[PDB]
């Protein structure tokens, strides 16, 4: 009954694959031949934000699409005004090895986390005026690789112990755990409708999770190697995974399978970060050839490049109004592009 | 308006104070040398950072260790907290001057695992430039094991029989030369890794350490000095 049900799960995995092949009625590139191509997008380093001492490994834009937060492994979490090129705040982190930072939608809070296995929440609009840590979310054992605020009181944090978790900042405990992943969870993106989130891991799998039920809604395994970063399509009915096999992939939620691949023969290094434009026509992907290529997400064509760094591009973000991109990198300097 | 120009002047004042703090911590950051500690549990990385500590480290996550010899700040990171897979959080330690990689030399069934780990460190694309200060630990236990017999390197390494010691030391291996044949052979098994890869972007620095020793910090000092000097000579060839 044990090996019998493992065999049944094997034929169940095979019938899921074959049912996806039956439900793959028409591909995306088949119908888009009538579409005019997006043309050559050329984008320029509008701002160049200097003032990190070590490699920048994460950034998050603000919801007002002007402020941003950058995380770098010298120990500084810095809030930057992109318009003025003025560092609004600088934060000395308790442990410098951080891999993620999240900006709250209200803007009152900022998050960080890394190899010290605690998700630190700093309050910005504070009573005294000096920003300080408001909460230290402990309970994950692996390194924290992505965190995202839902609100001022709910944050999802991915981790290197293969489990995502939904946390209450006020109590300080994990409201929900998400333990389905086999490999180290390297990213997460919450939906525009915020009812659900997808997270990718090193097991080449991206899993869709419902935040209220807390169960694995869906799993996608179309990649070959470690999924480094993930991002929903802005409609919320698809997402793009950037993985270390030098390919990006688009997965639709209701199709429950892969749509297209975003890769070229020349590009052989890994995606470190991936993001979407406001319409979602341009898929943006940072890389380890020190650049940031942008694809027609509908046509799968390498339609531009953002070469401004001489180390790898770790983090990639797009404003909510779409007016800017912020590519941080390991060369300690972040850049605003349009 | 006038108030908006006053507020952007306040933004410039805040930016000036932030930038002054950033330079004031930049000087400290560039003065301090970061080091990554790797190894296994049987390999005495704990006692080695104990002699660096005795001559505020938290268990949760990173274990940090701070020391200085000859007024040079060394800050070295034992990762005691993460999981057993390390293909991703090892990318954080890419701006590190030198990796200290501690090997239990007296356990020959874990030596091949240690060699594979060293090979991964040497050939990692984000570790292609970091020198590895190799610390072949527990040379008391290796000497006692080889002198005791009943456990042979040819059991776990067939090419030990075709080995002789090219260069050695008199006082430390002065009890018996056969253990010298042991203690250099393992060393060559790392250097065979350390030579075949790359056009000299980084250098291994092997060392022989017993259970308790004193000159670990001095060895880290001199090997970091040689690696940073080699970096600056490659910059003199370039800058």
């Amino acid at each position, epitope marked *: 009954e044990l090996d019998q049900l493992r065999q049944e799960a094997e034929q169940l995995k095979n019938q899921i694959r074959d049912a996806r092949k039956a439900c793959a009625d028409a591909t995306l590139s088949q119908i888009t031949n009538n579409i005019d191509p997006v043309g050559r997008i050329q984008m320029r380093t509008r701002r160049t934000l200097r003032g990190h001492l070590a490699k920048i490994y994460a950034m998050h834009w603000g919801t007002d699409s002007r402020l941003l937060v950058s995380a770098s492994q010298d120990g500084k979490l810095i809030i930057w005004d992109s318009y003025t090129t003025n560092k609004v705040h600088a934060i000395p982190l308790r442990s410098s090895w951080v891999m993620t930072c999240a900006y709250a939608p209200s803007g009152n809070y900022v998050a960080c986390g890394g190899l010290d296995n605690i998700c630190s929440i700093y309050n910005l609009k504070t009573r005294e005026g000096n920003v300080r840590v408001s909460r230290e979310l402990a309970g994950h054992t692996g390194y924290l690789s992505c965190c995202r605020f839902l609100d001022d009181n709910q944050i999802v944090t991915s981790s290197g112990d293969t489990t995502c978790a939904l946390w209450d900042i006020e109590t300080g405990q994990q409201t929900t755990t998400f333990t389905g992943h*086999t490999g180290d969870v390297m990213s997460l993106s919450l939906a525009p409708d915020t009812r659900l989130f997808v997270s990718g891991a*090193c097991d080449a799998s991206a899993k869709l999770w419902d935040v209220r039920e807390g169960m694995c809604r869906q799993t996608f395994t179309g990649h070959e190697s470690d999924i480094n970063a993930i991002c929903f399509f802005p409609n919320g009915n698809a997402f793009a995974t950037g993985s270390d096999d030098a390919t990006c992939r688009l997965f639709d939620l209701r199709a429950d399978q892969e749509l297209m691949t975003y890769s070229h023969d020349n590009i052989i290094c890994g995606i470190t970060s991936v993001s979407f434009s406001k319409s979602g026509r341009l898929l943006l992907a940072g890389y380890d050839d020190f650049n940031c290529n942008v694809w027609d997400a509908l046509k799968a064509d390498r339609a531009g490049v953002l070469a401004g760094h001489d180390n790898r591009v770790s983090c990639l973000g797009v404003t909510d109004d779409g007016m800017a991109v912020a590519t941080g990198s390991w060369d300690s300097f972040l850049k605003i592009w349009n | 308006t006038e108030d908006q120009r006053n507020e952007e002047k306040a933004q410039r004042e805040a930016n000036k104070k932030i930038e002054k703090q950033l330079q004031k911590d930049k000087q400290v950051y560039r003065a301090t040398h970061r080091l990554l500690l790797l190894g296994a549990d049987n390999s005495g990385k704990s006692t080695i950072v104990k002699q660096m500590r005795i001559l505020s480290g938290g268990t949760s996550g990173i274990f940090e260790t701070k020391f200085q010899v000859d007024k040079v700040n060394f800050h070295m990171f034992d990762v005691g907290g993460q999981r057993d*897979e390390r293909r991703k959080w090892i990318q954080c330690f890419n701006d590190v001057t030198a990796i200290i990689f501690v090997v239990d030399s007296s356990d020959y069934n874990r030596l091949q695992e240690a060699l594979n780990l060293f090979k*991964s460190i040497w050939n990692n694309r984000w570790l292609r430039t970091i020198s590895v200060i190799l610390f072949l630990n527990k040379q008391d236990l290796l000497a006692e094991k080889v002198l005791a017999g009943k456990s042979k390197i040819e059991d776990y390494f067939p090419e030990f029989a075709r080995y002789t010691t090219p260069e050695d030391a008199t006082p430390e291996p002065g009890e018996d030369p056969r253990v010298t044949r042991a203690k250099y052979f393992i060393r060559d098994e790392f250097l065979r890794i350390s030579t075949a890869s790359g056009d000299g972007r980084h250098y291994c620095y092997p060392h022989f350490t017993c259970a308790v020793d004193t000159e670990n910090a001095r060895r880290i000092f001199n090997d970091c000095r040689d690696s940073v000097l080699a970096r600056y000579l490659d910059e003199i060839n370039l800058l």
Partner: nanobody
Amino acid sequence: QVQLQESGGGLVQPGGSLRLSCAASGFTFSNYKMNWVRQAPGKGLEWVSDISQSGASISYTGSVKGRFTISRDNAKNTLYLQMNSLKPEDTAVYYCARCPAPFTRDCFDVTSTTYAYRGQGTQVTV
């Protein structure tokens, strides 16, 4: 899905041979450096052998250096371990394992509890 299915295995005498096989699915086989790992009973996972992307660089752990030999068929997407001269300490569960990244020389396959890109494993015994 990245799926590695083992084959071969089964009973063999204490001087016998088995050709352990691993078929690969869901990735370009030529891009990845391949490994053979064994889980001994009462022991942790330990690396046995590996082969480069082109089949040029081949290495073995020292207990099996002369005895075993590996070959990889990129046409058939299959990793082969010819196992000669079995001992009772050669009896273990045998996993093929591809290295986590492509186009790379570094590998982090043999882990303590789990690794994503191992096969299911076929047991070999005395």
